[PDB]
Amino acid sequence: ELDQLRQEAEQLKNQIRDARKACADATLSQITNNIDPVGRIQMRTRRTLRGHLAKIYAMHWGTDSRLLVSASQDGKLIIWDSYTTNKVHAIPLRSSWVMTCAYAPSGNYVACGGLDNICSIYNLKTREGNVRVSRELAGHTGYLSCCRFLDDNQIVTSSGDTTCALWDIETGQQTTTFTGHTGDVMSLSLAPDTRLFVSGACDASAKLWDVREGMCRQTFTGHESDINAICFFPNGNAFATGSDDATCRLFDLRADQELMTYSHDNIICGITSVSFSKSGRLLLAGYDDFNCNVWDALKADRAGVLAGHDNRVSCLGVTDDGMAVATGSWDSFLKIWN
Amino acid sequence: QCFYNESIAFFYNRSGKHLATEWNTVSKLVMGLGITVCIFIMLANLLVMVAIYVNRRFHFPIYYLMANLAAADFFAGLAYFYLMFNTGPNTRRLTVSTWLLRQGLIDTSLTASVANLLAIAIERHITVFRMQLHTRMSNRRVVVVIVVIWTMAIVMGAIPSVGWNCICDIENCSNMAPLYSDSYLVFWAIFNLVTFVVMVVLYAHIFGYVRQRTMRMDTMMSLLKTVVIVLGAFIICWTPGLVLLLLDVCCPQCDVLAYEKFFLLLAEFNSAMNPIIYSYRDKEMSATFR
Amino acid sequence: VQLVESGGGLVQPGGSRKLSCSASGFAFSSFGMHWVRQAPEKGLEWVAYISSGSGTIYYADTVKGRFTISRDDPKNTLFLQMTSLRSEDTAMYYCVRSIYYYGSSPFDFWGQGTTLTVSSSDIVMTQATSSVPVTPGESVSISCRSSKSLLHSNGNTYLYWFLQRPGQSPQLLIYRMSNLASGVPDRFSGSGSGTAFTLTISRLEAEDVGVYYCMQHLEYPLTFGAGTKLEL
Amino acid sequence: SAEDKAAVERSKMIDRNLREDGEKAAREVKLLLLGAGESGKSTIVKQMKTGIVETHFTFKDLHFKMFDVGGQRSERKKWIHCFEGVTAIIFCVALSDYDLVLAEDEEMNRMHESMKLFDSICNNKWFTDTSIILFLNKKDLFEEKIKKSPLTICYPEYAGSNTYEEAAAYIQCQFEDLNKRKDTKEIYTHFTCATDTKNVQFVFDAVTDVIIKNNLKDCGLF
Amino acid sequence: SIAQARKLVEQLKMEANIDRIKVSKAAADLMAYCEAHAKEDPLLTPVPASENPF
Ligand SMILES: CCCCCCc1ccccc1CCCCC(=O)N[C@H](CO)COP(=O)(O)O
Incomplete structure (x- = not known):
């Protein structure tokens, strides 16, 4: 019967919740009480990239920490050179409605997608020197919200159809499909080892997925509204979520609990992007307050603010070497903060 | 053919003009009035420039010309302020070069005021007439014309100070400005007039175009009120100067020096009113005033 | 193409x-x-x-x-x-x-x-090796010298390399020092700094025998070097 | 450097194309269309000339782009903000929905649901300033439907005859009672006129109005 | 809706059947990695303009 399984199912949530309390020995805030603070983090706009004629939704750094990508509703995908602020490529999109970007780890490929329900992959290194579109991954039924390359052939995408998928670019078919989210999936983050990835959905939950098996290992709750951004800790043993509850939370994968909440009474708008520092000591979160805060990731003390944007800070990414932090916004400008 | 020999003493004696060796009932009243107006103009452009620079929203080409007009009028408040502290018996302290300085300040400052008006006008015409929606613009053509305004303002205030004046025909020049030539006065005033007719065609075309097309299918009140009051400030504060000059250069039996001391005050009242004609409607910027 | x-x-x-x-x-x-x-x-x-x-x-x-x-x-x-x-x-x-x-x-x-x-202020690149004898399967190094520090401020040594097989158009091998062109085997490699440059071939064949050239791109007019023909 | 200099030549040749195409594109007119499945958006688009379907047609040297976002079937909360700043919001409702009900819900009138969508859209924080063109289609069909069937069925409080004129009128004002931003947005309602297809000319005219009112901002009238 | 419930119950049963470590030890590990790589962090310790690409 439905009630047999339901009265059963609500019990299974109890042992999960019962065991999590038993493993809640002491709060990270108590353990990190005597750590010396990070001090005022004064970070200034070094470079400002101009050339977008609409609001920016997505940006992604390169693995060489110098090039980066950005997409906007103007239907242009631009590859920047952050050092010399000069445009390397300006890719016209078939669909002006683009909500995500990814720059391949090898830098041979770039991918974008949005309301067109397609993940388009553009080839950068092309004999005829004109970025050409390679493949169009059309297997989703809702807007694509995120996409992250594993290799030049594997890309994992999260969509508004409550499902994530792992693709094979050569064949253009979903190698694996991740199901179990009861709300629209907003963002995903890959583990450093590229064996696991966590996804945040509109159902106020984050799920840890396994890329090979295709089954969800753990599910984290605690937020009150949509989860809009997610990133792993550098060591791949923790991750942070940005929600519309104007709180950032640091979850652990081994302890399977929540550690911190980064909430401030002053802040009432929703978090749009989150990202870490190379050491994992700073958690940069791009709010709707038009500004971007920098949190002490082990003290939960707002040490630093990056207020330079007219409109909301849509995307926010840090370099692999951690020498810079770049924030996009709806004001059509990318700013490199160092 | 020139007799540049003289001082101001010779030039008043060369004119019909009287030094007003002494301060007077009338003179005290008029000294007070010139300095009072100057104070209003300078203070008001102070507010305008402060606000136009402090706000990030007032960072668009029109507000650029707005700040420029504030600056030009500040320069005019100063030219008129320098003309005061130099009137009545004080004028006896003057020399030819220095008097040409006082009058040069006046010429350029007012030409600057006139031009800043023409600029704002031209911009609004262009903006209204396009059939695209947004087309967000840079401040290239605004600073091109900001320098056209200042460059030509200086060259106009400098032409009598370089070539064109009655050191060469003393008898053959103004009665009131004893050394500027009738020719110079005429030239300055033609300039003003052609700028003004340009202003009139444009603003009218604006009201007509909007009304015809759209209404064919209420804001018309504010649109009409603004366009119309803009043209009037200029005419009611320029017609004085210019008709006074036309009279000095054409007419006998025209006692034109009589209402000289007030007409100037009116041309300066023009600059007095510009900040508020352009910002009574910028209620947002106006309130910004704190 | x-x-x-x-x-x-x-x-x-x-x-x-x-x-x-x-x-x-x-x-x-x-x-x-x-x-x-x-x-x-x-x-x-x-x-x-x-x-x-x-x-x-x-x-x-x-x-x-x-x-x-x-x-x-x-x-x-x-x-x-x-x-x-x-x-x-x-x-x-x-x-x-x-x-x-x-x-x-x-x-x-x-x-x-x-x-x-x-009918009938310019950079000079110098390589004094010509008609060098070499056998297939051996390792050969080709040396180049400049009259100016090609290492720019940003760290780019704008020195290029080319290979002209007999009766063919020149072909790029190395577009900047410590870089390898597209479609050229891994055997070709180049290491150098400032005014001293080398081109090292690990093992060669009858296909890559010919004359080699050195070019700088630090500033115009892109002076070339003399040839360096591999003899076989 | 020789290299860096040529580089930035490209970067400016990029920027020339950007601005240029940005201005070709900014000139196009962007209408967002919404509605119920049977609103007849399909029949409207037919009259006017996957995922987000885009439609292009020109009228009196004006180019229109229509973003039919009908099928997204996802949380509108997350993707509507993308269309903020479309010139106007064409909204189609079929007048023939007063006596119906969705086959999914028990007895919630299709018309009462049409309002709720409009309610959430006319009161959407992202379109505070946007004008709303309301096409009410299916007028003829409503005429026949009403000629036999009462209107009290849908509006229990209705003081009026089953005369098409009076009947429609109530509804029109009823839809227009949804907006709280009374002189912040302007609702230009038209009744679908099948044959003349001046459905489009109404649009031409509607568009201009909103544009013209907006121009009174850009023209420096302030 | 029977299938969705049956797929649901085995999901949490797999989720409950994992090894869980104490937050005490996991707290130290996040403390250990941040301090071990603290001096390689540009943003934590600001770097002089000589080694600053921006
Ligand atoms: C030089 C012409 C430029 C263009 C016309 C400016 C103008 C406009 C409207 C009224 C007047 C003028 C100047 C008139 C002379 C200058 C003066 O200052 N006069 C007064 C009048 O009482 C005596 O000044 P002063 O002799 O006491 O120094």
């Missing part, structure tokens, strides 16, 4: 002839083109250059004000207008394409060039 040029042949001295290079199979409108001439017995020598959209036109010392270079983007052609040819303009005129953006490979593709036989 082939490039072919038209013209050349036999011209009396003082005559004005035109060279047309019809690009086909690539985005010609976004490629900065060059011209490089090779004397019948001597090495390469840069002559001209046009940027993308005809924004920037440069020339060599020997052809300044004598040659006019133009491009016709819609027709995918490149033109060279030569005026009053001298006896020292007898050379094979290759046409080279190059695109400049972060990490690009300029001078990657070379035309077949045309034969032209007229």
